[PDB]
């Protein structure tokens, strides 16, 4: 101009944008890094370190698995008639009953957890010519030898084990789930002395499905006083369908059925403790905040959760580019 004192009859009018002192770097299509006024984190990296029980109905398995609790293990009798949204399995859990294996244990674990209930109902299975309630020292309940509370170990009555045959029609409007099994003796003498016949057989069958499993007499590892085993199976009887159980030996009979539902429940393996709080997302690392759209805590989740990603941080700009003075 220069005129150190500006004139009365003219004016100046400048335009501009705001700014902050300490900005933050984001990534765009154009730039690798670029400073903005404020940004926000989209990836939940921090867990709460515990499971919140006030949102969804949680159930702690303690030292019992979902299958042990279902089967009816002596030290899992507290779990009778329980329903849940999320069952929790601990790493230190175990079995202290008769040693067993379940062909396709994973599929059975999936079906029970999804239904989300252990609602058992006993039924009047009329067994003819056999001794009910078999007991074992490997499975102790109280001050006596016992067995799985939802299973029935059938053995010979006198000097004869006749061919069993029983009916049980499903007259309800829901799916019944029967859990049954078969025994595997350690020697030929056990087989012959226990169930008379040299070879047992268990033909469970409906109008459409059938299952026949033959025993296999042989030595297995010593497990709580037993070198024998018991295999477990299941058959889902549909509304109107009829259950039939034919066997001439080695039958571990079912006492009743489980009520199956198209549930919205599940099971999870986690070792963190459960505590009083509110959270709608649950991972093996505890519950997490479900406000962020993504998370880097765990791929395994249950409930209203954000989507898992390999990135640990994604800054979304919530403001303009910052240009300090």
């Amino acid at each position: 101009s220069q005129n150190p004192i500006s004139n009365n009859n003219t004016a100046t009018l400048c335009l501009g944008h705001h700014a902050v002192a300490n900005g933050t770097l984001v990534k765009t299509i154009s730039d690798d890094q670029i400073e903005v006024t404020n940004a926000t984190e989209l990836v939940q990296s921090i867990s709460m370190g515990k499971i919140c029980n006030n949102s969804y109905r949680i159930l702690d398995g303690r030292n019992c698995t979902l299958i042990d609790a279902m089967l009816g293990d002596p030290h899992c009798d507290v779990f009778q008639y329980e329903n849940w949204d999320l069952f929790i399995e601990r790493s230190s859990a175990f079995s202290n009953c008769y040693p067993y294996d379940i062909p396709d244990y994973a599929s059975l674990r999936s079906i029970v957890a999804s239904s989300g209930t252990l609602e058992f109902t006993a039924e009047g299975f009329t067994w003819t010519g056999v001794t009910q309630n078999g007991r074992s020292g490997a499975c102790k309940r109280g001050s006596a030898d016992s067995f799985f509370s939802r299973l029935n170990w059938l053995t010979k009555s006198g000097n004869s084990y006749p061919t069993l045959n029983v009916t049980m029609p499903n007259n309800k409007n829901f799916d019944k789930l029967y859990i049954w099994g078969i025994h595997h003796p350690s020697s030929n003498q056990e087989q012959t002395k226990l169930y008379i016949q040299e070879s047992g057989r268990v033909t469970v069958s409906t109008k459409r499905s059938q299952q026949t499993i033959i025993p296999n007499i042989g030595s297995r590892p010593w497990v709580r006083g037993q070198s024998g085993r018991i295999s477990i199976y299941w058959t889902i009887v549909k509304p109107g369908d009829i259950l039939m159980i034919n066997s001439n030996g080695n039958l571990v009979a079912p006492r009743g059925y489980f009520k199956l539902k198209t549930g919205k429940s599940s099971v999870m393996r986690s070792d963190v403790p459960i505590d009083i709080c509110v959270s709608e997302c649950i991972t093996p690392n505890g519950s997490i905040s479900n406000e962020k759209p993504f998370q880097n805590v765990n791929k395994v989740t249950y409930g209203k959760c954000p989507k898992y990603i390999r990135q640990n941080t994604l800054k979304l700009a919530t403001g303009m580019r910052n240009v300090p003075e």
């Binding site: 004016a11 999804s114 429940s265 997302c281 990135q311």
Partner: protein, 172 residues
């Protein structure tokens, strides 16, 4: 910027301005002053406010899924379970990265535009009474009290009233 307003012909922003994103700093007979522009500020906030909701819905509720962790080595059916999960994670990881890049890219594009929009909006009112000096500033060639600054700010600037005084001061 692509319009070249922010970090361009505007050398820098102002840390002094705290009641808005865009505004005016002026100097006249009555003195200096400042005033934020609420219309251009709000337009930028309206768009930026929760701009992930327009593509990703808050969060989905999910229940029983497949097993993503195993203890025993099994083979075929296990391999497929692993492969399915990685492909999902890989595809979502890509989507998240691409999303933020475009959102961030767009966030800078719109704010840069607003600064440029307000600049042109002002220039049109001023007509031939002022000149773009450079640095995002206008030299107004007539007397302009705070009442006359408000008239530019609220859109009711009547350039015809000052045109005689303005044109005369420009060409001398």
């Amino acid at each position: 910027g692509i319009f070249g307003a922010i970090a361009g012909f505007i050398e820098n922003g102002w840390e002094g301005m705290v009641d808005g994103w865009y505004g005016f700093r002026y100097q006249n007979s009555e003195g200096t002053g400042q005033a934020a522009d609420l219309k251009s500020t709000q337009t930028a906030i309206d768009q930026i406010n929760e701009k992930l909701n327009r593509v990703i819905e808050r969060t989905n509720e999910k229940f029983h899924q497949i097993e993503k962790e195993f203890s025993e080595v099994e083979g075929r059916i296990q391999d497929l379970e692993k492969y399915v999960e990685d492909t999902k994670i890989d595809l979502w990881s890509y989507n998240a990265e691409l999303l933020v890049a475009l959102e961030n890219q767009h966030t800078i594009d719109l704010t840069d535009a607003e600064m440029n929009k307000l600049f042109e909006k002002t220039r049109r009112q001023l007509r031939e009474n002022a000149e773009d000096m450079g640095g995002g500033c206008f030299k107004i060639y007539h007397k302009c009290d705070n009442a006359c600054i408000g008239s530019i700010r609220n859109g009711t600037y009547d350039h015809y009233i000052y045109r005689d005084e303005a044109l005369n001061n420009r060409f001398q």
